[PDB]
Amino acid sequence: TFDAPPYVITPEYILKKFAGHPPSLIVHLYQNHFRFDQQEGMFQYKSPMRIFIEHLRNRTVPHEIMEYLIQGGVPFYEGCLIVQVFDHRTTVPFSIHNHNPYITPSPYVPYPPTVYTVVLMPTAQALHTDLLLKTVTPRDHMELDPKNIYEVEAKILLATYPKLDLEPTKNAEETIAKLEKLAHPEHSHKPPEPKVRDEALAAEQERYMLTLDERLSSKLWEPRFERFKLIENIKQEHAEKKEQE
Amino acid sequence: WVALFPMFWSAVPKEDRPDLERGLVTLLTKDYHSRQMDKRPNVVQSLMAGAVKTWPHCKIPPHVLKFEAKTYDAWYTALHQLENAAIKPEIDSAAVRESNLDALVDLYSTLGEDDLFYGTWRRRCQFVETNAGLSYEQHGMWEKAQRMYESAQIKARTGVIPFSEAEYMLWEDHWVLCAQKLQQWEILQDFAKHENFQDLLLECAWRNTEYWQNQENRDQLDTVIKGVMDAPTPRRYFFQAFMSLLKLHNKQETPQDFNRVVDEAIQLSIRKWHQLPKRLTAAHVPLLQNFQQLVELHDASVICQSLAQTNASNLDVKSGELKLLLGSWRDRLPNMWDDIVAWQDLVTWRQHVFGLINATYLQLIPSFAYRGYHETAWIINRFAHVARKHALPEVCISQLSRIYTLPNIEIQEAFLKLREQAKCHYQNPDELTSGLDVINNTNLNYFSAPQKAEFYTLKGMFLEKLGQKEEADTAFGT
Amino acid sequence: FVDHTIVLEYFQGAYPNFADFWLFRRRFSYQLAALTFMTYTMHIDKRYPHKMNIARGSGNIWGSEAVSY
Amino acid sequence: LKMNFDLEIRKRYAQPLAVESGEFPDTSNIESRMLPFCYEAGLSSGHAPDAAQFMSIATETF
Amino acid sequence: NIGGAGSGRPTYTQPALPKTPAFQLEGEGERVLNKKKLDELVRQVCGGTAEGQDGNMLTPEVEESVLNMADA
């Protein structure tokens, strides 16, 4: 038997219960990009990884990278994730006349963070993804035969919600009061809003001056170092093979 | 015309110049000018010169000039404005400056002016590793350049300091160039296969001599060669001609088709020669090497025809005939200060031809029929010496060590092996173990008096460094 | 009195055709590098402007009266 | 030797969708999308030169 | 331009006569024509629009549906 969560999970309860334990994730925020603690690269806010920032804003578990999180062995605390957020966010380029200690002078110029802790709550999509991943993960062979999915989900639901409210009401006022009392913060938002839809000479001069430029004309940039990584992989494979011989 | 255009342009009202500039750009890029490419005074040159004689008051985009100069032989007219706009840009804007610099660097690269290219790219970069790598590439130190480029990429991965895209492309391109200079073909082949680089793939595949013997392998390479043939270039035409020669050798083609292919290649080479500046620049050297390659292609075709026809009847008399041509070939070499890739190409081509000869002559014997091995040994030794003079680490040693296994021990091959062994003494520090082991015992010294005398002299000189004064004294006294 | 664009102006005026000026300057740079090495290693001191000879036909430089101090 | 057919199919997702950008598909976008589809099905040669315009006209008609 | 290496790279590097890249000296630009295309089609099928009004023939929700239709 395992202790079951309360009806409404709050950051206070989770942070107090699991105090003294390592956080699940650490994220550093910069002016225009972010990264994790052990990540050497970076992610742009305009890249596909904006979903993680959206989930952080909404305090929801990111089910879309569940398999990646599993591969890394990230810890869960009653199905939630504790995340630490570090806030680092808070001449004449392309001129040949600039000086630099490694360059000749040139004759045309005269001469030379706040920290935060947050909690992300689970959702139904997360459980769906968990069961789906278990269905296609080899260990019978497979880790979970589909025909047992309903029983497994029933047992998980039984463990998650051990107590319900099974007391009948006698009139409409009692039902109204019960509905009012049981309201949930995550399901009490509001309905969304309807969806809605001098220098010209300088710009034209620049556009004219960039005529027939193959690459810069189209723009008028997210490096990933894929060729370098391919070279590294091939070099490692060749060296390892040479080890045998 | 070039005297009249500025005077008439001076009379145009300042408010109407942009319309005439746009019209001039439209007229310069017309498609009917291609019926005038070969005539030397052509209208493109005159219009460009007239426009550039009044550059500040008449502006033409840099890349229009760059595109037209390469096709209509107006190189220096474009260089004038391109490197005058770097000193004093017409418009204050980063994009315009970057585009002008890109066009200028492209022209420098096409004309073969290496030093100006490096000097221009070193005043433009932001990282210090890029500067150091370019400087080390300037003095032909490829290992250090590769290491600096790797360090630059690794430090850029962090992302703390922003960079541009041009440096990002430069790192990869010049890493590949340095890898080519260091003879790292084994990994470049797989890199090109993964990246879908057809020309690099052909360059790598051409370096494997045995790969071209299998019928399936050459049937495969034919598809790639035909795929890269809708944009003919001199190198692609050379590869096509080589494939045609291989097909002819195996009675799958008539000599007439081979001759037609060679004629097309020669015509394209002449056309490309006619588009360069009249006076001999650094861009003419590869074309001369290509001319020599075509001549030797025809010579090798004659070799194959005569060999097959005469050996069809088992007549072992044509060795003397082949000796004359081989001796003639022994005197057509590049200059010592030429690019190393040229020597690589020469060695590979001669190895292919000698392999053909050896394959034809081996099936007949079961002395006179072991000349390909001697020629290969000679050319490999010469290339090793040249590579040593280029200060290439381990390339000379690698070439001298890859010749360990060679059959048909003969007087010529034995003498070449002894010369190679005498060449093993590089006079480099920290090589005492090899010298001591050689001194312990190395073959026999009964071959010839001068060879043993020079071996003893080398032994004494080696002992001199270790401090064995009397030992070396006795050694070279003997 | 003396700005920094006098020699460049003279030699731009001496070559109406630009290819000639480009080739001349390319030669002149290498020749000046060689002369610099020569004068710097041997301790040659009094290099007055009337001791630098420039060949307008090629771009060669000959420093006359070069003795060690 | 071999052609890596898996390096061009991945290019399909680089270009934005019509809903994402707000531009009605035209000859350029259709031409960009054509090649990965051909490579996926095994059409090594590619497509005929004058198919993008036909596709654009068909889309407008639909 | 064939080979797959790329074009316009400012690094250290040809046919006899390359083809001229496409360009446009001045005009509306594709970014405007592509956005006006849908309004043009709506005008075509709608029968005709009176003077003093155009462009706003579909609500924001229907344009997204139409674009999704085209993509699919």
Question: Rounded to an integer, what distance in angstroms lies between the CA atom of residue A135 and that of residue A67?
Answer: 13
Question: Rounded to an integer, what distance in angstroms lies between the CA atom of residue A61 and that of residue A69?
Answer: 11
Each residue of D11-40: b (16+ CB within 10 Å) or e? eeeeeeebbeebbbbbeebbeebbbbebbe
φ, ψ dihedrals at A71, nearest 5° = -55, -35
Residue whose structure tokens are 């790279």: E9
CA-to-CA separations, B455 to B389, B398, B472, E60, in angstroms, rounded? 21, 22, 12, 92
Contacts 24+ apart (CB under 8 A), B318-324: B319/B368, B319/B369, B319/B371, B322/B357, B322/B371, B323/B371
Question: Rounded to an integer, what distance in angstroms lies between the CA atom of residue B125 and that of residue A58?
Answer: 43
| C30 Cβ contact partners less than 8 Å away, ≥ 6 residues apart | none
Q: Provide, as residue numbers in chain E, all residues whose Cβ is less than 8 Å from the Cβ of D59.
A: 70
Contacts 24+ apart (CB under 8 A), D44-53: D44/D3, D52/D27, D52/D28, D53/D27
Are B64 and B58 spatial neighbours (Cβ–Cβ below 8 Å)?
no
Are B374 and B410 spatial neighbours (Cβ–Cβ below 8 Å)?
yes
If one counts every other C-beta atom within 10 angstroms of the C-beta of residue B425, the result is 18
If one counts every other C-beta atom within 10 angstroms of the C-beta of residue B253, the result is 16
To which H or E segment does residue D61 belong? helix D52-61
Q: Diameter of chain A by CA atoms? A: 96
Are B325 and B357 spatial neighbours (Cβ–Cβ below 8 Å)?
no
Dihedral of the alpha carbons of B79, B82, B84, B88, in degrees to the nearest 10: -170
To which H or E segment does residue C61 belong? strand C61-63
Contact between chains at A216 and B95 (C-beta distance less than 8 A): yes
On whether any CB of chain A is under 8 Å from the CB of E26, the answer is yes
Dihedral of the alpha carbons of A171, A177, A179, A182, in degrees to the nearest 10: -140
Question: Rounded to an integer, what distance in angstroms lies between the CA atom of residue B375 and that of residue B303?
Answer: 15
Contact between chains at A214 and E61 (C-beta distance less than 8 A): no
Upper half-sphere CA count for residue B107 (Cβ side, 13 Å): 28
Contact between chains at E3 and B231 (C-beta distance less than 8 A): yes
Q: Provide, as residue numbers in chain E, all residues whose Cβ is less than 8 Å from the Cβ of D37.
A: none
Resolution (A): 3.5
Question: Rounded to an integer, what distance in angstroms lies between the CA atom of residue B192 and that of residue D22?
Answer: 38
Count each helix (H run) and each strand (E run) in chain E, helices first: 2, 0
Kindly give the residue spans of alpha helices, DSSP state H, lying in C15-61: 18-41
Question: Rounded to an integer, what distance in angstroms lies between the CA atom of residue B174 and that of residue C19?
Answer: 30
First to last CA, chain B: 82
CA distance D61 to chain E (A): 10
Are C19 and B277 spatial neighbours (Cβ–Cβ below 8 Å)?
yes
Question: Rounded to an integer, what distance in angstroms lies between the CA atom of residue C32 and that of residue C22?
Answer: 16
For an interface test with E, the pick among D23, D27, D29, D35 (most E C-beta atoms closer than 10 Å) comes out as: D23
If one counts every other C-beta atom within 10 angstroms of the C-beta of residue E14, the result is 12
| A75 Cβ contact partners less than 8 Å away, ≥ 6 residues apart | A21, A22, A24
Residue whose C-alpha is closest to residue B417's, from B384, B456, B440:
B384
| E12 Cβ contact partners less than 8 Å away, ≥ 6 residues apart | B109, B117, B173, B174, B177
Residue B165 corresponds to which tokens in the numbers above?
């895209």
CA distance B76 to chain C (A): 6
Burial of A212 (0-12, 13-18, 19+ CB in 10 A): buried
On whether any CB of chain C is under 8 Å from the CB of B82, the answer is no
Question: Rounded to an integer, what distance in angstroms lies between the CA atom of residue B233 and that of residue B236?
Answer: 5
Q: Give the residues across from A118 on adjacent strands.
A: A83
On whether any CB of chain E is under 8 Å from the CB of A211, the answer is yes
**SS3 state of residue D53:** helix
Question: Rounded to an integer, what distance in angstroms lies between the CA atom of residue B34 and that of residue B72?
Answer: 9
Question: Rounded to an integer, what distance in angstroms lies between the CA atom of residue B164 and that of residue B128?
Answer: 14
CA distance E12 to chain B (A): 6
Q: Which chains touch E (3 or more CB pairs under 8 A)?
A: A, B, D
If one counts every other C-beta atom within 10 angstroms of the C-beta of residue A214, the result is 14
With CA atoms as reference, the chain B residue closest to D1 would be B220
For an interface test with E, the pick among B233, B237, B269, B271 (most E C-beta atoms closer than 10 Å) comes out as: B233
**SS3 state of residue D3:** coil
Residue B147 corresponds to which tokens in the numbers above?
């290491």
Are B94 and A94 spatial neighbours (Cβ–Cβ below 8 Å)?
yes
Question: Rounded to an integer, what distance in angstroms lies between the CA atom of residue B183 and that of residue C44?
Answer: 45
Question: Rounded to an integer, what distance in angstroms lies between the CA atom of residue B135 and that of residue B138?
Answer: 5
On whether any CB of chain B is under 8 Å from the CB of D1, the answer is yes
With CA atoms as reference, the chain B residue closest to A43 would be B159
Question: Rounded to an integer, what distance in angstroms lies between the CA atom of residue B166 and that of residue B127?
Answer: 12
On whether any CB of chain C is under 8 Å from the CB of B277, the answer is yes
Q: Are strands C52-54 and C61-63 parallel, antiparallel or unpaired?
A: antiparallel
| B292 Cβ contact partners less than 8 Å away, ≥ 6 residues apart | B332
Q: Are strands A33-36 and A43-44 parallel, antiparallel or unpaired?
A: antiparallel
Are A14 and A80 spatial neighbours (Cβ–Cβ below 8 Å)?
yes
| B475 Cβ contact partners less than 8 Å away, ≥ 6 residues apart | B456, B457, B459, B460, B463
Of A94, A212, A230, the CB nearest to B94: A94
CA distance A109 to chain E (A): 27
Are A121 and A186 spatial neighbours (Cβ–Cβ below 8 Å)?
yes
Q: Provide, as residue numbers in chain A, all residues whose Cβ is less than 8 Å from the Cβ of B95.
A: 206, 210, 216, 220
**SS3 state of residue C39:** helix
Q: Provide, as residue numbers in chain A, all residues whose Cβ is less than 8 Å from the Cβ of E60.
A: 195-197
Question: Rounded to an integer, what distance in angstroms lies between the CA atom of residue A223 and that of residue B153?
Answer: 11
**SS3 state of residue D35:** helix
Residue B451 corresponds to which tokens in the numbers above?
């060879």
| Residues of chain E with a CB closer than 8 angstroms to some CB in chain D | 30-31, 34-35, 37-38, 41, 63-64, 67-68, 70-71
Residue A131 corresponds to which tokens in the numbers above?
């069961």
Question: Rounded to an integer, what distance in angstroms lies between the CA atom of residue B110 and that of residue B286?
Answer: 12
On whether any CB of chain E is under 8 Å from the CB of A164, the answer is no
Contact between chains at E25 and A211 (C-beta distance less than 8 A): yes
Are A84 and A117 spatial neighbours (Cβ–Cβ below 8 Å)?
yes
Name residue D32's amino acid: S
Q: Give chain A as a 3 state SS string.
A: CCCCCCCCCCHHHHHHHCCCCCCCEEEEECCCEEEECCCCCCEECCCCCHHHHHHHHHCECCHHHHHHHHHCCCCCECCEEEEEEEECCCCCCCCCCCCCCCCCCCCCCCCCCEEEEEEEECCHHHHHHHHHHHHCCECCCECCCHHHHHHHHHHHHHHHCCCCCCCCCCCHHHHHHHHHHCCCHHHCCCCCCCCCCCHHHHHHHHHHHCCCCCCHHHHCCCCCCHHHHHHHHHHHHHHHHHHHC
**SS3 state of residue C54:** strand
Crossing angle of helices B215-227 and B198-206, in 10° steps, is 150
Residue B460 corresponds to which tokens in the numbers above?
């004494």
Residue B141 corresponds to which tokens in the numbers above?
């130190």
DSSP character at residue D6: T
To which H or E segment does residue C62 belong? strand C61-63
**SS3 state of residue C38:** helix
Question: Rounded to an integer, what distance in angstroms lies between the CA atom of residue D39 and that of residue D42?
Answer: 5
| B86 Cβ contact partners less than 8 Å away, ≥ 6 residues apart | A96, B97, B100, B101, B104
CA D40 from chain center: how many Å? 11
Residue whose C-alpha is closest to residue B63's, from A110, A209, D28:
A209
Residue whose structure tokens are 């969806």: A195
Contact between chains at B193 and D2 (C-beta distance less than 8 A): yes
Are A119 and A15 spatial neighbours (Cβ–Cβ below 8 Å)?
yes
Residue B395 corresponds to which tokens in the numbers above?
């390339």
Q: Provide, as residue numbers in chain B, all residues whose Cβ is less than 8 Å from the Cβ of D7.
A: 194-196
φ, ψ dihedrals at E52, nearest 5° = 85, 5
Of A206, A212, A230, the CB nearest to B91: A206
On whether any CB of chain E is under 8 Å from the CB of A196, the answer is yes
Q: Sheet containing A25-29: which strands, arranged edge to edge?
A: A43-44, A33-36, A25-29, A81-87, A114-120
Residue whose C-alpha is closest to residue A43's, from A52, A58, B165, A74:
A52
Residue whose structure tokens are 């007949």: B364
Q: Are strands A81-87 and A114-120 parallel, antiparallel or unpaired?
A: antiparallel
Contacts 24+ apart (CB under 8 A), B109-117: B109/E11, B109/E12, B109/E13, B110/B70, B110/B283, B110/E13, B110/E14, B111/B75, B111/B281, B111/B282, B111/B283, B112/B281, B112/B282, B112/B283, B112/B285, B113/B282, B114/B138, B117/E12
CA distance E50 to chain A (A): 23
Of E21, E25, E26, the CB nearest to A214: E21
On whether any CB of chain A is under 8 Å from the CB of E7, the answer is yes
Contact between chains at B123 and A96 (C-beta distance less than 8 A): yes
| C40 Cβ contact partners less than 8 Å away, ≥ 6 residues apart | none
Question: Rounded to an integer, what distance in angstroms lies between the CA atom of residue A147 and that of residue A150?
Answer: 7
- Measured on CA atoms in the order A67, A73, A78, A81, is the torsion positive or negative? negative
Residue A91 corresponds to which tokens in the numbers above?
């001449």
Are E71 and D19 spatial neighbours (Cβ–Cβ below 8 Å)?
yes
If one counts every other C-beta atom within 10 angstroms of the C-beta of residue B221, the result is 21
With CA atoms as reference, the chain E residue closest to D19 would be E67
Of E4, E10, E26, the CB nearest to B106: E10
If one counts every other C-beta atom within 10 angstroms of the C-beta of residue B155, the result is 15
Question: Rounded to an integer, what distance in angstroms lies between the CA atom of residue B137 and that of residue B144?
Answer: 8
Question: Rounded to an integer, what distance in angstroms lies between the CA atom of residue B42 and that of residue B276?
Answer: 15
Residue whose C-alpha is closest to residue A42's, from B169, B160, B172:
B160
Residue whose C-alpha is closest to residue B129's, from B103, B111, B154:
B154
If one counts every other C-beta atom within 10 angstroms of the C-beta of residue A209, the result is 21
Of E30, E31, E71, the CB nearest to D18: E71
Q: Provide, as residue numbers in chain D, all residues whose Cβ is less than 8 Å from the Cβ of E34.
A: 23-24, 26
Contacts 24+ apart (CB under 8 A), B8-12: B9/B54, B9/B57, B9/B58, B10/B54, B10/B57
Of A96, A227, A230, the CB nearest to B86: A96
Question: Rounded to an integer, what distance in angstroms lies between the CA atom of residue C56 and that of residue C64?
Answer: 17
Dihedral of the alpha carbons of B237, B239, B241, B246, in degrees to the nearest 10: -170
Residue B37 corresponds to which tokens in the numbers above?
């490419």
Question: Rounded to an integer, what distance in angstroms lies between the CA atom of residue B238 and that of residue B294?
Answer: 8
| B477 Cβ contact partners less than 8 Å away, ≥ 6 residues apart | none
CA distance A193 to chain B (A): 38
Residue A98 corresponds to which tokens in the numbers above?
């600039």
Count each helix (H run) and each strand (E run) in chain D, helices first: 3, 0
Q: Give chain B as a 3 state SS string.
A: CCCCHHHHHCCCCCCCHHHHHHHHHHHHCCCHHHHHCCCCCCHHHHHHHHHHCCHHHCCCCHHHHHHHHHHHCCHHHHHHHHHHCCCCCCCCCHHHHHHHHHHHHHHHHHHCCHHHHHHHHHCCCCCHHHHHHHHHHHCCCHHHHHHHHHHHHHHHHHCCCCCCHHHHHHHHHHHHHHHHHCCCHHHHHHHHHHHCCHHHHHHHHHCCCHHHCCHHHHHHHHHHHHHCCCCCCHHHHHHHHHHHHHHHHCCCCCHHHHHHHHHHHHHHHHHHHCCCCCCCCCCCHHHHHHHHHHHHHHHHHHHHHHHHHHHCCCCCCHHHHHHHHHHHHCCCCCCCCCCHHHHHHHHHHHHHHHHHHHHHHHCCCCCCCCHHHHHHHHHHHHHHHHHHHCCCCCHHHHHHHCCCCCCCCCHHHHHHHHHHHHHCCCCCCCCHHHHHHHHHCCCCCCCCHHHHHHHHHHHHHHHHHHCCHHHHHHHHHC
If one counts every other C-beta atom within 10 angstroms of the C-beta of residue B264, the result is 14
Are B220 and D28 spatial neighbours (Cβ–Cβ below 8 Å)?
no
For an interface test with D, the pick among B190, B193, B197, B212 (most D C-beta atoms closer than 10 Å) comes out as: B193
φ, ψ dihedrals at B371, nearest 5° = -90, -30
Dihedral-angle region of residue B341 (phi above 0 means left; psi in -120 to 50 means alpha; beta otherwise): alpha
Chains D+B touching (3+ CB pairs under 8 Å): yes
For an interface test with E, the pick among A207, A209, A220, A227 (most E C-beta atoms closer than 10 Å) comes out as: A207
First to last CA, chain D: 43
Contact between chains at E37 and D24 (C-beta distance less than 8 A): yes
Residue whose C-alpha is closest to residue A88's, from A59, A113, A121, A54:
A113
Question: Rounded to an integer, what distance in angstroms lies between the CA atom of residue E11 and that of residue C54?
Answer: 35
DSSP character at residue E21: P
CA distance A45 to chain E (A): 25
Dihedral of the alpha carbons of B337, B338, B342, B346, in degrees to the nearest 10: -60
CA angle D33, D39, D44 (to 5 degrees): 125
Number of B to E CB contacts under 8 A, please give it: 62
Contact between chains at E11 and B231 (C-beta distance less than 8 A): no
With CA atoms as reference, the chain A residue closest to B91 would be A206
Solved using: cryo-EM
Are B350 and B375 spatial neighbours (Cβ–Cβ below 8 Å)?
yes
On whether any CB of chain B is under 8 Å from the CB of C22, the answer is yes
